[PDB]
Symmetry: C4
Subunit: 196 residues, 4 copies
């Protein structure tokens, strides 16, 4: 067992680092199962040469909508749950993380099947905020996934290995994903199938 | 489908922007139905030439009150729910947003009908906080709606259109509202009517 | 109806203000009923000549305790609820506010009667944080109430009046309290009495 | 009864203090019972010569995991509850505090017995954030506990005494722990045993 973090709070990541450069999100999001739940996931990278303090991730679904009364809200925003209720949206971001949105009854993907996904006109905006530890300054980084950038039935390739007491990141694999056996039903349909 | 936000996090809003100027709230609030719920709504504008980081909206009802014991609290404040429990009060404010307060059993408007509204001596204070992305500094903008500035049975005119790959804002329409068919009952009365 | 706050966000408080000076808490806390609930209350003042942005109030009970297993924690701290769950701990602090802690089943005062109060060895630490609007800087102000500084059966004298379109504060009354008819039972005892 | 904190907000701790130096976490975490609950605890120290404003504690369990579907997440992070839901993670850090994680059904230690603990490949990362009151700057301090640094059946030795109106800290005892009678069952097993 080789420490991620030393008792003195130094991280055993990126040997020879010195902990302006910009934060990377994965080009694609993926949907697939984790412990029996359908989840939407995307990857967020760290800053090789600074800690980000009070780092937090949020995500908005951007989607035009009509209310039952006929009000048309172009580009309507709604907050997509990525750990808000348990503090898991507060990141310890010292190597890349896969951020997971569990597609449950409160999720806007609840009723979206694999066939249905491509027909949807929607966009996920991902927003990381924090304080660059050196800089002193609050920062925000953003990205976006439209429908065609969400891969149904895929997982992220892992980036992290241990070399000589220090965890290292294959940034070559950062955006890489692979196919895995995944149902094609919506989360709602899965839940209904499961409940008889 | 034309992106709101580019993979690199630049927003496709206000072509030729450069992302001190001051934030605008709509002159009026409106009350009307959205998906079968009575909602109080107001509009908050963006800053044409800076992002606001960690932007959040709150609202206080200011209303003198007497407790059942006879204590008189002049200008008593109470927090009006505008997305606190789901993180929807954390704004991605890159074009104007309609902020919605659903008038449910916990709302101070729960028992206020259309006829009753004008007889009420109350004020809504709206408070946007965040960090101007350039400036570096925390900012706060405020406004206020007294009873006569709340329009029962109205919606906001939409401001947003797509022109040549870029979303544009008709600021001429920012404060504009229009009439829509709306019950005159209080939310409480609506709920009671609905439950038989 | 004279506005607390103008559409442009200027506050109608302290005519001739210019919105380092220090924040005042009331010398005493009081306990008495509000709408059928026993509440512990204290007063927090505003800064005559700056807004405080992202202002928030918290309070800790400081009290030595022994666990059932016999562990002695000197000066053990626990968080006293002053609006955390509804966002009412986020203050719009432009004139003095009475901050209220409702003494319910989760409160550390739940079982404390009027006779019992003076026998208790406890201290309430009150902590206001925020950003002074000019200064630029985060600030914290603190105070403290020991047992003998908590007045059972009292309310705060009101400080606020309207003079010529502007709300004014009688700072002479800031610390002043008055006696009101109040049961001497603990909140727990009151609840039990009420439930038969 | 000698005040922890004076009415003017000065703390009666470290006589002759002047309220860069670095924050200390205890070398070890301990597990033992508090009021009938198994708790994981660690100690966090204060800064002798500055207040920390808006101080907050969080903790991540770092543990490689395989999902039921066979996805391997190396160094998977999950947030360990240390007061998030009651605001008790917001510290009034003016002398050392023992931070407590109650091992309940939602805890990742729920099923970990005393014999099982040493066989686990896990790490707890503890993260204190806040604003150094003078400095002006946001700070973060970190540390870490691997399995062998968690002492099952132990409590922290108390550090705090009153000398001449001022609370003083025996920093010699800061890391010191002592053995106490503690069941060897997992929290889950304890709960099951208790429920018949
Ligand atoms: Mg901040």
């Amino acid at each position: 067992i080789q420490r991620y973090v030393r008792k003195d709070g130094k991280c055993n990541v990126h040997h020879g680092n010195v902990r302006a450069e910009t934060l990377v999100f994965s080009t694609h999001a993926v949907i697939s199962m984790r412990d029996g739940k359908l989840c939407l996931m995307f990857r967020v990278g760290d800053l090789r040469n600074s800690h980000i303090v009070e780092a937090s991730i949020r995500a908005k679904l951007i989607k035009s909508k009509q209310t039952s009364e006929g009000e048309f809200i172009p580009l309507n925003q709604t907050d997509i749950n990525v750990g808000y209720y348990t503090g898991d949206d507060r990141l310890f971001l010292v190597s890349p993380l896969i951020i997971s949105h569990e597609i449950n009854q409160q999720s806007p993907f609840w009723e979206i099947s694999k066939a249905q996904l491509p027909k949807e006109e929607l966009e996920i905006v991902v927003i990381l905020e924090g304080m660059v530890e050196a800089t002193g300054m609050t920062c925000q980084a953003r990205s976006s996934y439209i429908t065609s950038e969400i891969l149904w039935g895929y997982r992220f390739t892992p980036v992290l290995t241990l070399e000589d007491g220090f965890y290292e990141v294959d940034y070559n694999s950062f955006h890489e994903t692979y196919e895995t056996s995944t149902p094609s039903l919506s989360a709602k349909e899965l839940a209904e199938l499961a409940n008889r």
